[PDB]
Coordinates of C-alpha atoms in Angstrom, one line a residue:
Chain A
X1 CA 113.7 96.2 71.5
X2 CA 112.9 92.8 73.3
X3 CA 111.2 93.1 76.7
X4 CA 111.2 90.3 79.1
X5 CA 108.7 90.1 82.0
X6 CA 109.6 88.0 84.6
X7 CA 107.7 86.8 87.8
X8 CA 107.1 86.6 90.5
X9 CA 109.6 89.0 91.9
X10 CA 109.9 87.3 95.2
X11 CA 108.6 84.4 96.4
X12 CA 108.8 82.7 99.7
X13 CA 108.6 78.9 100.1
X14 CA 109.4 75.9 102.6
X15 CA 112.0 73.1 101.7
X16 CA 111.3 70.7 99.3
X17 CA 108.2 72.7 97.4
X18 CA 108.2 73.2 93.5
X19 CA 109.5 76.3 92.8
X20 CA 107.8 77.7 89.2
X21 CA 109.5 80.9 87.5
X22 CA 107.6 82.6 84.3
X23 CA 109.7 84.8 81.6
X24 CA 107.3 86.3 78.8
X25 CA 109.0 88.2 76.2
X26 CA 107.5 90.7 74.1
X27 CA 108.8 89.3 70.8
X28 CA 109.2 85.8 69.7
X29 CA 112.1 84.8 70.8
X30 CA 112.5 81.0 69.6
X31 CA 114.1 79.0 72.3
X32 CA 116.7 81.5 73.1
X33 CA 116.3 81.8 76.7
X34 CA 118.7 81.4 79.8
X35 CA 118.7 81.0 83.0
X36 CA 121.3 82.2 85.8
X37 CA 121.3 81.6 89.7
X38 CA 123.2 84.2 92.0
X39 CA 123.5 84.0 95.6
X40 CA 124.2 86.9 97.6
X41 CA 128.0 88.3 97.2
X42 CA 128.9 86.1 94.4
X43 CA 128.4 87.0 90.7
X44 CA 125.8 84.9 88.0
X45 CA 125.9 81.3 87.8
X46 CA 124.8 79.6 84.2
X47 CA 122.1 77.1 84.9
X48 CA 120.1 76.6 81.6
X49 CA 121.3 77.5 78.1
X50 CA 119.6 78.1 75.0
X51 CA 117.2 75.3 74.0
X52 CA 116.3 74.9 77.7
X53 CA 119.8 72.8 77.6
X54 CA 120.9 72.0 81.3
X55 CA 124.2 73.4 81.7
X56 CA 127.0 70.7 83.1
X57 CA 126.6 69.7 87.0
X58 CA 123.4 71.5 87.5
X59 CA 121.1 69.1 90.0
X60 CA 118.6 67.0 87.3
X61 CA 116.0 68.8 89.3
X62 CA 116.3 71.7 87.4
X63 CA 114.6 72.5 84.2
X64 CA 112.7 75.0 81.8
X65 CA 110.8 74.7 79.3
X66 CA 109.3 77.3 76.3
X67 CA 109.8 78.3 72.8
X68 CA 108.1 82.1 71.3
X69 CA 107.1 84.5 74.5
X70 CA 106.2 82.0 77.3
X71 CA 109.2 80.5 79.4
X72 CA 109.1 78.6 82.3
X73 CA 111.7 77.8 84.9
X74 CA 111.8 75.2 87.6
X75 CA 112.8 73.5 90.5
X76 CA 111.8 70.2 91.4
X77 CA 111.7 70.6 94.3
X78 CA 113.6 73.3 96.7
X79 CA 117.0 72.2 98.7
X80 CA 118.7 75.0 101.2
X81 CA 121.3 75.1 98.4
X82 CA 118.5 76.9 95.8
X83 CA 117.6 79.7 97.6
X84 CA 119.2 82.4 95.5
X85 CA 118.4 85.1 93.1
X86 CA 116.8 83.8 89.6
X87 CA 117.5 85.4 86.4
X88 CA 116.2 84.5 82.9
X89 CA 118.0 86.4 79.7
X90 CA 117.1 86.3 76.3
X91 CA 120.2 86.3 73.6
X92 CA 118.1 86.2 70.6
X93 CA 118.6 90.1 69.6
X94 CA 120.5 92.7 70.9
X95 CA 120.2 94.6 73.4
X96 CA 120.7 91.6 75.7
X97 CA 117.9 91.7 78.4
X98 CA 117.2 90.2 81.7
X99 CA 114.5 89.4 83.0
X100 CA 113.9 91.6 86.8
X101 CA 114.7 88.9 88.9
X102 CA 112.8 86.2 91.2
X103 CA 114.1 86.4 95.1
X104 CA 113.4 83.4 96.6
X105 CA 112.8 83.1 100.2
X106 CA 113.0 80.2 102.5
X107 CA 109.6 80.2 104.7
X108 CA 110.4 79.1 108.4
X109 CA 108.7 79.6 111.9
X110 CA 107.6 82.8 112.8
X111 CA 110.3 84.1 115.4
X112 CA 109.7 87.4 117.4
X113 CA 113.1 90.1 117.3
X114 CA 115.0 90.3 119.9
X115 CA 115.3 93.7 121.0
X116 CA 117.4 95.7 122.7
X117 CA 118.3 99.4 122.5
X118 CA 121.9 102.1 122.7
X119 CA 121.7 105.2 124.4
X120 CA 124.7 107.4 122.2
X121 CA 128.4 106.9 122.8
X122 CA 130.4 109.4 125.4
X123 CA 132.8 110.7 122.5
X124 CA 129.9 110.9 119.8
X125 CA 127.9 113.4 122.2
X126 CA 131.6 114.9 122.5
X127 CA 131.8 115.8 118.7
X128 CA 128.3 116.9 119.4
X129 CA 126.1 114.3 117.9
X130 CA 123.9 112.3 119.5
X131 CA 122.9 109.0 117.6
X132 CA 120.6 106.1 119.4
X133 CA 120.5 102.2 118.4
X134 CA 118.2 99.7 118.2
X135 CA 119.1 96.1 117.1
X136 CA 116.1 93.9 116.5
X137 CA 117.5 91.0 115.8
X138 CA 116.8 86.8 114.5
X139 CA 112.8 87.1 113.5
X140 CA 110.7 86.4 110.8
X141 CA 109.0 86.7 108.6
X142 CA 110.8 90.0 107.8
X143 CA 107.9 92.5 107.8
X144 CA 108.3 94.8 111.1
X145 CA 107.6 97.9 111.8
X146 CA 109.7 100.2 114.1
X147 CA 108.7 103.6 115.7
X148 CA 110.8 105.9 117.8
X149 CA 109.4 108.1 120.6
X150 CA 111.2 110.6 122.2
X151 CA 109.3 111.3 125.5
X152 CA 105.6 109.8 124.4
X153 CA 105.6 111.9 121.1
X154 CA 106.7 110.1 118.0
X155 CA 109.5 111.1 115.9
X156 CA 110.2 110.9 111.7
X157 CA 112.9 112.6 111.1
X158 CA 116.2 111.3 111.6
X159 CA 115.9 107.6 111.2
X160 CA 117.6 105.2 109.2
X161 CA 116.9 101.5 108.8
X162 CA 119.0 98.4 107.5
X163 CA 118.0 95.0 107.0
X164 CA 120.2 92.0 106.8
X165 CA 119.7 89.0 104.3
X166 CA 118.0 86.1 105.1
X167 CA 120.2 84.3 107.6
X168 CA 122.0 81.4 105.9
X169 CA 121.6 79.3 109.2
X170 CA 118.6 80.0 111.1
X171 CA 116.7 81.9 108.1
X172 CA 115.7 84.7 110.3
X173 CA 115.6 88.5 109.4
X174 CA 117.3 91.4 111.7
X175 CA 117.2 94.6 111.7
X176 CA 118.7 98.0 112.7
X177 CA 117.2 101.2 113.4
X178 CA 119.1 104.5 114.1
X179 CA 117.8 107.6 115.3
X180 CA 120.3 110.5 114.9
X181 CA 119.7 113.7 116.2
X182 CA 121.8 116.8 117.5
X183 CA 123.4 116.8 120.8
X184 CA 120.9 119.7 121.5
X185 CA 117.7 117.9 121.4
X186 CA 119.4 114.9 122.9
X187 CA 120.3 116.6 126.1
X188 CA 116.8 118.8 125.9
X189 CA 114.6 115.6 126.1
X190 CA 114.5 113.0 128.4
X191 CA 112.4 109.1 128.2
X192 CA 113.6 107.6 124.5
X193 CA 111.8 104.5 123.5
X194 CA 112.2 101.7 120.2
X195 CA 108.3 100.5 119.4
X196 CA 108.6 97.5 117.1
X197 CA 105.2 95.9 116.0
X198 CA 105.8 92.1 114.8
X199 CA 103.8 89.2 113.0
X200 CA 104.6 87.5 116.5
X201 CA 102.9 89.4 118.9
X202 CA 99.5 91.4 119.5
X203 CA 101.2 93.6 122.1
X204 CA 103.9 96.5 120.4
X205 CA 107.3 94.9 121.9
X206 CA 108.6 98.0 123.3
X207 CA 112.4 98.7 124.7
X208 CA 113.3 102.6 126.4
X209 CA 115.7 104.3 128.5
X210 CA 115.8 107.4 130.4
X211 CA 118.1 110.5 131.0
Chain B
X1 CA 139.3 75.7 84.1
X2 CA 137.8 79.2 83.2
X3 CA 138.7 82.2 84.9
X4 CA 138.0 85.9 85.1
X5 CA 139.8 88.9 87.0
X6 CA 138.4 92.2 86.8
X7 CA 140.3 94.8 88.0
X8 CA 140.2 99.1 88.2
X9 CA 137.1 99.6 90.3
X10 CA 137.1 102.6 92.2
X11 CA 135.4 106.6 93.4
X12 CA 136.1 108.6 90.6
X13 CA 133.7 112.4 90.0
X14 CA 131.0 112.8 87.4
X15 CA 132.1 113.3 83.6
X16 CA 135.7 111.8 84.9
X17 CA 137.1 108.7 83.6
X18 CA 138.1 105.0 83.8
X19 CA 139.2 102.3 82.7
X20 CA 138.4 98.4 83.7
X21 CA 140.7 95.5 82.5
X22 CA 139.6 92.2 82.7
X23 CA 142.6 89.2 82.8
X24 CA 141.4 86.1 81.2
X25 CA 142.8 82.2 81.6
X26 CA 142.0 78.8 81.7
X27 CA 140.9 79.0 78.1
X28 CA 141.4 80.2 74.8
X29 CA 140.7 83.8 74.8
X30 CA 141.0 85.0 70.9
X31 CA 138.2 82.1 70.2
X32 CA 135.1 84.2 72.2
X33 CA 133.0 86.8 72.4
X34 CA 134.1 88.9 75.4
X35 CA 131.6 91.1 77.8
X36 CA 130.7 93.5 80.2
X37 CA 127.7 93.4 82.5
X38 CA 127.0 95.3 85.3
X39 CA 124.6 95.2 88.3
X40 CA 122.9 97.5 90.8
X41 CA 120.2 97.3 93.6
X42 CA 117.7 98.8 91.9
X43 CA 118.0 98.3 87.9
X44 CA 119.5 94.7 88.4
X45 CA 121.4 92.8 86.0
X46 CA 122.3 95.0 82.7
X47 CA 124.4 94.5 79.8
X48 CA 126.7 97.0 78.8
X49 CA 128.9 96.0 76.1
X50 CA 130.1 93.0 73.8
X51 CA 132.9 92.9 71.7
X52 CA 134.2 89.8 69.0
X53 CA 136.6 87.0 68.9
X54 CA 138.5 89.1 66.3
X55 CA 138.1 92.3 68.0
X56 CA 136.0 93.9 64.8
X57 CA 132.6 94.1 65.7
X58 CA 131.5 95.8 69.1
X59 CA 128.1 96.4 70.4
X60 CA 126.9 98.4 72.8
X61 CA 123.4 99.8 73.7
X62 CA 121.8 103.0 73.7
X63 CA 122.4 104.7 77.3
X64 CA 126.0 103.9 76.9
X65 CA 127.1 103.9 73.0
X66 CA 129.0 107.1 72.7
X67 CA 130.8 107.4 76.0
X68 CA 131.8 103.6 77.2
X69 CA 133.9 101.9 74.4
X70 CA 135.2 98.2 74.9
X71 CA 138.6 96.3 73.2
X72 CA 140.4 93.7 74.1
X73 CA 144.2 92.5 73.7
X74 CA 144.4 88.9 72.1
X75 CA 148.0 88.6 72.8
X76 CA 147.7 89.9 76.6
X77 CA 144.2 87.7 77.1
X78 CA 143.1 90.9 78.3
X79 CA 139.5 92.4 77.8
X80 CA 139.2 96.4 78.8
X81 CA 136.2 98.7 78.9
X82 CA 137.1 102.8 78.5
X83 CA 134.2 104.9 80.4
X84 CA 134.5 108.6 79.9
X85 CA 131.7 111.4 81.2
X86 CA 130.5 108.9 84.0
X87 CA 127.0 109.9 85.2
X88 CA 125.8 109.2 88.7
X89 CA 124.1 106.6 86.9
X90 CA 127.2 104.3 86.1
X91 CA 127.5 103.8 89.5
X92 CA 127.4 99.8 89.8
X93 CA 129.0 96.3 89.6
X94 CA 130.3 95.5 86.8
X95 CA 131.4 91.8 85.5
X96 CA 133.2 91.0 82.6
X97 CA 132.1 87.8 81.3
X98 CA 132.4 85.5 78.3
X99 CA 130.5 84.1 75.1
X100 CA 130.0 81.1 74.2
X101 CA 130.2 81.9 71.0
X102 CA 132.8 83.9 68.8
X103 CA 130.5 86.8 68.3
X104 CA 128.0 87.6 71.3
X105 CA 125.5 85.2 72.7
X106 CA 124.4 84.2 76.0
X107 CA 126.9 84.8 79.2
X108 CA 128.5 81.2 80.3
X109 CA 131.5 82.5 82.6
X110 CA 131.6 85.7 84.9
X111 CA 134.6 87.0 86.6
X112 CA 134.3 88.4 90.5
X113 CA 133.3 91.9 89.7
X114 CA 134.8 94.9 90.3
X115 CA 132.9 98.2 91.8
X116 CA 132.7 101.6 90.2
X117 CA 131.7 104.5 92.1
X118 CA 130.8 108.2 90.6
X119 CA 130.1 110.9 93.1
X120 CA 132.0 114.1 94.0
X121 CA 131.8 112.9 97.9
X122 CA 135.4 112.6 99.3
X123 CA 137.1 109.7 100.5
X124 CA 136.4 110.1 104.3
X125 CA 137.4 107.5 107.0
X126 CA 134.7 106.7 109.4
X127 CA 134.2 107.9 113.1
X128 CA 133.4 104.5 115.1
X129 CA 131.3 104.6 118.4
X130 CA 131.2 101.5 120.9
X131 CA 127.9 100.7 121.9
X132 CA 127.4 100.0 125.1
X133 CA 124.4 98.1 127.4
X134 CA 121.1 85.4 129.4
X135 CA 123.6 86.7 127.0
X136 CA 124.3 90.2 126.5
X137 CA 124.2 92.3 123.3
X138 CA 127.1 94.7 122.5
X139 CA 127.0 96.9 118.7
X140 CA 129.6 99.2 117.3
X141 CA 128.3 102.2 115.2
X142 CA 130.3 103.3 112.2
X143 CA 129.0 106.5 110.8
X144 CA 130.1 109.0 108.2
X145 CA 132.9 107.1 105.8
X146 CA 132.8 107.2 102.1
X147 CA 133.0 105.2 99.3
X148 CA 132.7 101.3 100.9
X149 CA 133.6 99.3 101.7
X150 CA 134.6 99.2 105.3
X151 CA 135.2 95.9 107.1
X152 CA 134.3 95.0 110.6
X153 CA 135.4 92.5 113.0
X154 CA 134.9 91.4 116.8
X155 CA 138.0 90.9 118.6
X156 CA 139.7 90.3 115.1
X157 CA 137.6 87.6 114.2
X158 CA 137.7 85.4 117.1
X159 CA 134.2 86.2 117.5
X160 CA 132.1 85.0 114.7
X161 CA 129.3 83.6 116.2
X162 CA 126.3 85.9 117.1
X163 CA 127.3 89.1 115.0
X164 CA 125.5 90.7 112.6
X165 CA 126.4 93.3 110.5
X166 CA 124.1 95.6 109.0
X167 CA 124.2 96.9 104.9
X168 CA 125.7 100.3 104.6
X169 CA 122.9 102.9 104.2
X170 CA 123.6 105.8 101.9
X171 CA 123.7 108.9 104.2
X172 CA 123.1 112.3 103.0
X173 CA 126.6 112.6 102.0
X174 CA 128.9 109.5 103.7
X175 CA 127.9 105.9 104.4
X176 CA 127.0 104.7 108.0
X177 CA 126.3 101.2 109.2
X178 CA 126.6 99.3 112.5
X179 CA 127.1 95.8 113.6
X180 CA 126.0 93.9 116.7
X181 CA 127.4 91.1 118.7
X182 CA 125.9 88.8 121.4
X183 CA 128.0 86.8 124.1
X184 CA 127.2 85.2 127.0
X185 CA 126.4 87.4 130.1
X186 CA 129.8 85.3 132.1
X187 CA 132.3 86.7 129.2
X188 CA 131.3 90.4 129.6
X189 CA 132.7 92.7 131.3
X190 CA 134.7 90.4 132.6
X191 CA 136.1 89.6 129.1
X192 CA 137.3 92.3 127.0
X193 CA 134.7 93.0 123.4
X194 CA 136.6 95.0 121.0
X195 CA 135.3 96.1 117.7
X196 CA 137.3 96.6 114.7
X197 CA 137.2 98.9 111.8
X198 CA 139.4 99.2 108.4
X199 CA 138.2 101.1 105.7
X200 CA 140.7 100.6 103.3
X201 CA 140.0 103.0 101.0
X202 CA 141.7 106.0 103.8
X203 CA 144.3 103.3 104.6
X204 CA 142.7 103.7 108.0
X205 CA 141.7 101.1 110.8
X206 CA 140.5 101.8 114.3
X207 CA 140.1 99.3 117.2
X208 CA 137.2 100.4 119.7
X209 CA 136.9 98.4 123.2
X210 CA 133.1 97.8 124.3
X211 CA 133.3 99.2 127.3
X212 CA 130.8 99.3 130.4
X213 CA 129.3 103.2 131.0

């Protein structure tokens, strides 16, 4: 059926930048190309109808443009309020089909994690697990790395990692990083250290405990 | 003004069965093209079936023609969506949202959404850990529960500033996630941190204190 390309997938800007948004579709599609804004939790927002038609009580400083494969969408210029999730949909043949998505970013000042580590809980090494935390929190940009070494050597297995949204106040990232592992090779070891490598700084911020 | 209520969301095992309603008002419902759309991390936004003002044409595409079926109930304002032999693969948000036309067309109004989950995990309340040690930072680990969502709290929401609470991460079997809050180094001990935890879907709740090893 119809295919629609869209791009880029994210993009990271400051305030007040023109934001630019491409949809090509593999057929001609006429003019029959929309537009939807989503911010994180709430469902799609209508913002341009076919015929690049502004829906009601969008900002004027949104608009699109395009008729056959080549659609663009933008934004003026970039207000707080815009940073959302982009989505462009054709409705010209069935199946309907959205484009991927464009995840906009609001580019601040770099800002080193603050982090800060949790030797397991009494009652989880009770039930015989052994889990350890390690919070990194309010940095950016939002590429870090984290390694966990138990006692020098570095360890794989067992580690999970969760990232938050870009924060709506301070636009900073944080993130967690668990290493599980059995009660066993808990007790059996003894110096446990978080090793987070950030944009921010040459040296590995490092954070450990012992016993 | 328009509105749409989805409602039925909810853990049910591969090849079972379900079905959504959607409750429409605020406009006049046997006039439109009614939808469903759903949403997941990975796929994104995807359309899943359309049915008309009249209730005699229905589309739906390929992956899910066969086994989803939609109708609606013009005297009710009520849209509905049957799903029969769910896959793994219908796991998702799904929206019920209107045309602007009487027959299908682009999506002008979506409803909240309501969540559909197929696995053959159990429902299984999660086991929550206190984490434990300027301004100090205090976390609370909630590991092993299943399906979401679970919904965590410091000191039942008198402390909002400063916490930060992680997306689930899909385990091997059950969900786990933590959350981390920061107060000032005066309030703690000396204060008392507690970290709450419902997880409605085992009616349960648990109330953990931070306190100092």
């Amino acid at each position: 059926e119809t295919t629609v390309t869209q791009s880029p997938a994210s993009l990271s800007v400051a305030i007040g930048e023109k934001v630019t948004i491409r949809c090509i579709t593999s057929t001609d599609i006429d003019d029959d190309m929309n537009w939807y804004q989503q911010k994180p939790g709430e469902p799609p927002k209508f913002f341009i109808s076919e015929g690049n038609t502004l829906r009601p009580g969008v900002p004027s400083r949104f608009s699109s443009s395009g008729y056959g494969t080549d659609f663009v969408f933008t934004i003026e210029n970039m207000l707080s309020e815009d940073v959302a999730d982009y989505y462009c949909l054709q409705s010209d043949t069935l199946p309907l089909t959205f484009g991927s998505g464009t995840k906009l970013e609001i580019k601040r000042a770099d800002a080193a994690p603050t982090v800060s580590i949790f030797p397991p809980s009494s009652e989880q090494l009770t039930s015989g697990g052994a889990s350890v935390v390690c919070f990194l929190n309010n940095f950016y940009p939002k590429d870090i790395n984290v390694k966990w070494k138990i006692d020098g050597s570095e360890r794989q297995n067992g580690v999970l990692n969760s990232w938050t949204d870009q924060d709506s106040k301070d636009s900073t990232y944080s993130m967690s990083s668990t290493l599980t592992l059995t009660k066993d090779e808990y007790e059996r070891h003894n110096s446990y250290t978080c090793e987070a490598t950030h944009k921010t700084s040459t040296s590995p911020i490092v954070k450990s405990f012992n016993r | 003004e328009v509105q749409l209520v989805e409602s039925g969301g909810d853990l049910v095992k591969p090849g079972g069965s379900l079905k959504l309603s959607c409750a429409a008002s605020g406009f006049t419902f046997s006039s439109y093209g009614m939808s469903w759309v759903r949403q997941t991390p990975d796929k994104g936004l995807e359309w899943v079936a359309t049915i008309s003002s009249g209730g005699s044409y229905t589309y739906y595409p390929d992956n899910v023609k066969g086994r989803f079926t939609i109708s609606r109930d013009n005297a009710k304002n009520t849209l509905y969506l049957q799903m029969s032999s769910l896959k793994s693969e219908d796991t998702a948000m799904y929206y019920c949202a209107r045309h602007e036309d009487g027959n299908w067309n682009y999506f002008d109004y979506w409803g909240q959404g309501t969540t559909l989950t197929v696995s053959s995990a159990k429902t299984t309340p999660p086991s929550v850990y206190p984490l434990a040690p300027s301004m100090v930072t205090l976390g609370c680990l909630v590991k092993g529960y299943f399906p979401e969502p679970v919904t965590v709290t410091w000191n039942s929401g008198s402390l909002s500033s400063g916490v930060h609470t992680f997306p689930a991460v899909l385990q091997s079997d059950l969900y786990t996630l933590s959350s981390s809050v920061t107060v000032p180094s005066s309030t703690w001990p000396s204060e008392t941190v507690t970290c709450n935890v419902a997880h409605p879907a085992s009616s349960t709740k648990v109330d953990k204190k931070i306190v100092p090893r």
